[PDB]
Amino acid sequence: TPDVSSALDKLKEFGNTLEDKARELISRIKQSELSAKMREWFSETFQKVKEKLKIDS
């Protein structure tokens, strides 16, 4: 869902092609083989904060 400011106006024929390929590849993945290294890093960066602060652990 890309927010335009004369960007998809210039690439209107090329922009419409990889807009259909994004609602197709992400509808099935949805942070799976897009993340993997990102979901390991989120349960690591947030876990360092939570064990120190919150209430205690």
What CATH number has the domain bearing residue 5? 4.10.260.30
Domain enclosing residue 54, as ranges = 1-57
* Count of domains observed in the chain: 1
Experimental method: NMR
3-class SS string, 5-57? CCCCCCCCHHHHHHHHHHHHHCCCCCCCCCCCHHHHHHHHHHHHHHHHCCCCC
Instruction: Kindly provide the b/e burial profile for residues 12-43, where b requires at least 16 CB atoms within 10 angstroms of the residue's own CB.
Output: eeeeeeeeeeeeeeeeeeeeeeeeeeeeeeee
Question: Is residue 39 within 8 Å of residue 46, measured between CB atoms?
Answer: no
At position 23, the amino acid (one-letter code) is: R
